[PDB]
Structures are given as C-alpha cells and as structure tokens.
Amino acid sequence: PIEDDLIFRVGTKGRNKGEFTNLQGVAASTNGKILIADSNNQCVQIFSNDGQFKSRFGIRGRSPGQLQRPTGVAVHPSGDIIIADYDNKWVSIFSSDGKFKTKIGSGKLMGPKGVSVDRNGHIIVVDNKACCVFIFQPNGKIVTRFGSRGNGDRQFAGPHFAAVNSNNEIIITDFHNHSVKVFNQEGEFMLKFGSNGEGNGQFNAPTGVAVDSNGNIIVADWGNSRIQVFDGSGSFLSYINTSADPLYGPQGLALTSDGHVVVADSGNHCFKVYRYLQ
C-alpha cells in the first residue's frame, strides 16, 4: 500500500532536537504550532504545523519548574503551556517560552496523564493512577472530581487523554475499559462508546483523543495502533488511513489549526501529521 492520509512524519530515536525517546502528549495551538511532550527526554518540543522545529524546553528533575515524567500537554488560549507530570504528581503552567509560572494539584494527584482546558478556563486533569478526573480552577482549587477505579460507566481503568467539545462536554479515553466516555461540564456521565476487538469500529486501549467543530471524536488506540473517527453520538464513521506507514503504540493526538490530525507514533519515535478536514 503506497499512499495513505499521511502528509509527513518527523522524528527519530534520540535525545537531541527533533529526536524522541517516549512521545506522550501532543497539543496543537491556534498560532500554528505542534507541541510534543517526551516523558523520557523530560522535554516539550515545539514545531510548526508543517513539521519544522521551533524550540525545546524542559529541565530534568523533581523540583517545581522541572520535568521528571511529563505526559499530557495542552495550550491555554493565553499561549501558556500546561504539562502534566506522572512522577512529580502535579501539573505545571509554563509561558510559551518555557518559563515556569505555577503548579497545580500538588498533594492531590497520584499520576496524571491527559490535560485540557475547558470553555470556562478550568484545567481538566486525567489522573491515570487514581482513575479519576479533576476539574481545577487556575489557582489550583478543585471544582470537582469524578471517577474511581473500576470497570463500570462511572469508573475508569487507567484513563489516558481528554478533549472538550463545543458544548463544554468532557471526553475521556478509558484505556483498560476499552471505551471512550463523555461527561457534562459537572463531570456527570452521559454516554460511553467503543468495543474491544480488531474489526471495523473496534479498538484496544484508546489513548490520544481530539474533537472537531462538528463534535466528531478522533481516537488513537494503543493495542491496534489505528486512528478511528466517531460522531458525537459515539457511532463509528471512518479511519484515518495509516496503512502505508503504520502506527505502533500511538499516544497523544490533536487537531491542528490547518485542519490536520497529529499523532504521537511513540513506538516508531516520531509524530505523524494526517489529512483530515481537506
């Protein structure tokens, strides 16, 4: 299979600029940037939407303003960069140039992964290890928390990533329950979708997620390494065609300001950018 929906790929294994060890979170900004968090290189790298390297920041360590196992990444409308740290157990807010401003969740989080910003400016934090989701004020006060460890609708099993749709509904990938779950802005369960398998519309261990302007939910899965698109009611629509250069254990996923889908192809030490809107 010679061609698919891939536009370009960036990255090889390593610790230098444009190289990766463990791609995790992916974010994309309204200023036309792609941001990649690397949990094992302890850095965030910023690229243009066309894949050109722009900048890198991240100081290894366990103190405030350092990164130890950075996972989720989001960009605030302000341009600040929000980074979850699984090992430091807090979420940092950096400037667009990587200056540490504040951290939230310290003493509250067990092991965060996904981070997002809701339509009201709340910071949504997926606590992968605690199997719950927090909604924080920017000052670090908890608005609400939802979920606990388990297999049921209102539980999570290693939740990974988050997205927020135009109705301020929160979308969570529930990795070890093989489903995507949608909540209202109060954190109350609305619906789940997905099934564990290899056939059409099925997946295994959903990871990266995004939601488009029409409410369609774009989901990467770690176990089959595909990207599947669902409508906002959770019904399968289509694949993003990755067959010419397959994924291997994808992590974070984002929609870019130029209408593409970017995915962390972590097992192949690269990010891949796909046609989506055109």
Side-chain angles (χ1 to χ4, degrees), residues 197-211:
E198 299 177 12
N200 190 270
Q202 304 187 301
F203 56 25
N204 182 280
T207 56
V209 64
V211 62

Side-chain angles (χ1 to χ4, degrees), residues 22-255:
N22 189 354
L23 292 91
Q24 290 281 312
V26 176
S29 72
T30 64
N31 291 329
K33 305 302 197 306
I34 291 169
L35 296 82
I36 309 295
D38 188 325
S39 57
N40 295 31
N41 289 358
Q42 288 93 32
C43 70
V44 173
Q45 289 185 92
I46 309 183
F47 301 81
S48 67
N49 275 347
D50 70 357
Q52 291 295 116
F53 178 86
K54 298 297 288 178
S55 71
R56 175 170 68 167
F57 71 87
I59 309 303
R60 172 190 188 103
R62 298 189 185 265
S63 296
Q66 298 174 337
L67 299 182
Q68 184 62 226
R69 189 179 289 269
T71 52
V73 59
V75 180
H76 193 279
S78 66
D80 291 348
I81 300 166
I82 304 172
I83 305 171
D85 197 309
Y86 186 90
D87 281 357
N88 289 341
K89 305 176 190 68
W90 64 62
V91 176
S92 301
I93 304 180
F94 292 93
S95 80
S96 66
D97 296 315
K99 177 158 188 180
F100 178 77
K101 299 190 164 182
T102 190
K103 66 185 170 60
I104 65 169
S106 206
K108 300 295 198 333
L109 299 172
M110 298 186 164
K113 184 122 176 176
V115 283
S116 196
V117 181
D118 83 355
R119 295 201 92 214
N120 288 323
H122 301 124
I123 301 178
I124 296 154
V125 180
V126 179
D127 191 338
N128 167 270
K129 185 171 183 182
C131 297
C132 69
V133 179
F134 291 89
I135 306 183
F136 284 102
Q137 310 283 28
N139 71 7
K141 291 295 158 121
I142 295 165
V143 177
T144 195
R145 62 177 287 168
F146 58 101
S148 64
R149 185 175 311 88
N151 303 128
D153 284 349
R154 289 173 181 74
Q155 293 168 329
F156 298 110
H160 267 58
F161 288 104
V164 181
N165 74 11
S166 69
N167 288 321
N168 212 34
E169 298 155 353
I170 301 168
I171 302 154
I172 307 294
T173 54
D174 193 3
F175 184 102
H176 273 298
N177 286 324
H178 306 287
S179 63
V180 176
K181 296 176 171 172
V182 185
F183 306 84
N184 70 16
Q185 68 187 353
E186 289 79 30
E188 292 146 11
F189 178 84
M190 300 179 67
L191 66 95
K192 70 176 189 297
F193 65 89
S195 63
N196 184 359
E198 299 177 12
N200 190 270
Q202 304 187 301
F203 56 25
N204 182 280
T207 56
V209 64
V211 62
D212 76 15
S213 63
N214 288 317
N216 305 309
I217 303 169
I218 306 149
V219 187
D221 75 297
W222 199 75
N224 304 333
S225 301
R226 299 190 291 189
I227 299 166
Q228 37 266 304
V229 182
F230 302 82
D231 67 26
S233 298
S235 290
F236 175 75
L237 298 174
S238 60
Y239 294 100
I240 299 185
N241 184 2
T242 60
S243 66
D245 183 357
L247 309 174
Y248 177 39
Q251 291 285 355
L253 183 146
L255 280 160

Side-chain angles (χ1 to χ4, degrees), residues 14-27:
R15 286 184 188 276
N16 293 327
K17 290 173 180 164
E19 301 172 350
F20 304 103
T21 299
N22 189 354
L23 292 91
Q24 290 281 312
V26 176

